[PDB]
Scaffold this active site. Sequence first.
Site, PDB file in Angstrom:
ATOM      1  N   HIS A   1      17.112  -8.328   0.692  1.00  0.00           N
ATOM      2  CA  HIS A   1      17.255  -9.209   1.841  1.00  0.00           C
ATOM      3  C   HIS A   1      18.577  -9.982   1.934  1.00  0.00           C
ATOM      4  O   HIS A   1      18.931 -10.465   3.013  1.00  0.00           O
ATOM      5  CB  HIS A   1      16.084 -10.179   1.918  1.00  0.00           C
ATOM      6  CG  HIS A   1      16.139 -11.283   0.896  1.00  0.00           C
ATOM      7  ND1 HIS A   1      15.521 -11.195  -0.324  1.00  0.00           N
ATOM      8  CD2 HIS A   1      16.666 -12.533   0.957  1.00  0.00           C
ATOM      9  CE1 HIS A   1      15.653 -12.337  -0.974  1.00  0.00           C
ATOM     10  NE2 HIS A   1      16.346 -13.164  -0.210  1.00  0.00           N
TER      11      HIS A   1
ATOM     12  N   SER B   1      18.313 -16.802  -4.517  1.00  0.00           N
ATOM     13  CA  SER B   1      17.762 -15.497  -4.856  1.00  0.00           C
ATOM     14  C   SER B   1      18.740 -14.814  -5.787  1.00  0.00           C
ATOM     15  O   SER B   1      19.962 -15.012  -5.689  1.00  0.00           O
ATOM     16  CB  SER B   1      17.592 -14.627  -3.609  1.00  0.00           C
ATOM     17  OG  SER B   1      16.502 -15.039  -2.822  1.00  0.00           O
TER      18      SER B   1
ATOM     19  N   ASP C   1      11.774  -5.339  -2.546  1.00  0.00           N
ATOM     20  CA  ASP C   1      12.801  -6.160  -1.928  1.00  0.00           C
ATOM     21  C   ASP C   1      13.956  -6.213  -2.941  1.00  0.00           C
ATOM     22  O   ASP C   1      14.677  -7.204  -3.052  1.00  0.00           O
ATOM     23  CB  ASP C   1      12.239  -7.560  -1.631  1.00  0.00           C
ATOM     24  CG  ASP C   1      13.179  -8.406  -0.778  1.00  0.00           C
ATOM     25  OD1 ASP C   1      13.919  -7.814   0.033  1.00  0.00           O
ATOM     26  OD2 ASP C   1      13.159  -9.666  -0.922  1.00  0.00           O
TER      27      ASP C   1
END
EC number: 3.4.21.90
Lengths: 149, 149, 149, 149
Positions: D27, D101, D49
């Site tokens: 992402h 992240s 992901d």
Amino acid sequence: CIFEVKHEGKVMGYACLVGDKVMKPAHVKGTIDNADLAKLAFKRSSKYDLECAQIPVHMKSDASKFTHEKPEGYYNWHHGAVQYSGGRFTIPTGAGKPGDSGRPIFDNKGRVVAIVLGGANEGARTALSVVTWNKDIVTKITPEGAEEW
Amino acid sequence: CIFEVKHEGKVMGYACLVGDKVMKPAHVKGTIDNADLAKLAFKRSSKYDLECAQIPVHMKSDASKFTHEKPEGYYNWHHGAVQYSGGRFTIPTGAGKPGDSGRPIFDNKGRVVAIVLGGANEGARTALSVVTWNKDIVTKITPEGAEEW
Amino acid sequence: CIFEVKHEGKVMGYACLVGDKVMKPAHVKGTIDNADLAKLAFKRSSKYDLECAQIPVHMKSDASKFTHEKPEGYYNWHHGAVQYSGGRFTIPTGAGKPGDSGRPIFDNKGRVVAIVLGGANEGARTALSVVTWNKDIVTKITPEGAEEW
Amino acid sequence: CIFEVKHEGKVMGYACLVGDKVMKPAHVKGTIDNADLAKLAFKRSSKYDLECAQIPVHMKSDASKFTHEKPEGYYNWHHGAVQYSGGRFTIPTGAGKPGDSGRPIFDNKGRVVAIVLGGANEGARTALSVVTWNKDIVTKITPEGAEEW
């Protein structure tokens, strides 16, 4: 706020973040030595020998405000102190050379008052050719016989 | 004077008792966490992103007056001190986040000067997007690229 | 004057600003890690395993002069002291490894005397394979069994 | 081992050298701010992901090992100490924001234990949504209502 225009790896003039635009003299060869600034779309204006664009949001905090307010007296610029009187900015001849265009002339509170474009040598002192703000609108004062720096 | 808009038990923005009306940004989801205020009939205004109503007589003593008078300098707001200059309110980026809309910007005498709606991040500082009073009438200043808080 | 050739983010050899040209061994993979230098147009020469171009005006002050004058004795190079005698430059075996090509061998006054291309291991000492100036013209000395660094 | 993903000159997330692969959340917009890493060929995996590639030989010494071994207790991460219990990693709400992240959660011996993808706010504390190793194989734990950082 000041950024340098480079040409073939050589500083030609400067670029300045004034108000909400990004300025740099039109006559200056090269491209602003800053990624964010270099990729912009400038609008040339041969009357003013100006070439402005808009400041990216992430640098807008980095602009410098300027002012129409300029009472006779001394102003500040990178090489020293500029003198304003008779509607003319001047400096000791020799203290400004080609490659100084774009450099702002601040006052004592930091407000940019004019932007140097070049200067005419009239002996002891050189009358600067600048871009200055009027009541609200931009203007350009060019002393007779100016040498575009 | 400040009341909080709650949505699904969560504070979304604020509501303010300014003048004789009860304000709250239109974009804010939820209902004012106050019985008396919640049951009112608000008049939306999408141009101003404002949504006003009238203050019940029993709370009118609780309103805050605002003023068109705002000279360059520092103003007060919940997170610190706002700075006004060049016709723009700004703050250190990070000191204002989503959920701060509705919060008033007071001066040193308590007069509400503007009401925050959101802010545009322009680096070091964020230019606030506010609702401010003109000569007599309300107005809305929204800096380029504002993020509605 | 010394600039490094990088390949896939890894230093392969070096590039040097000698005279008015910009040198780098032809066998070295990669591109000079310097904007101004990288965008140049080089002229390859497989006989000399050389690959020269011209130094941009803004870096010409950064070149290093070289000299045909090289009397038997000790010379200077990044890893220590090179020894010249019998028309051959040598060094203690182990003190020069692959990825040292392009590195100049200066004398005590700074004049570049030769440019290393590789070396042949002949025991205690390794005879260097260099690019050296003759009466006026460039030349290349490659000891028997050289291993191109 | 940690490298930052940049997008339009702005840090969006991170990339990490774990095991023998080079990871970065799928992402995350942007490209790894490292020449060697940026030019790689990544294999996307929308289930996880995740978006991995292989570490160039010259950086393999720079990887970080991870481990399936994670006993209830406190773990280490850039912003402080993560807490593991009930098969869930958590942190004081506010200590992890969008753009975190890719950041690894190490143990006290340096072994990477999980890689943060986002977090679900459940009041005082936020349950992290991480990529963690099982018996041997990779896995992804995503608490109900996670906000992908």
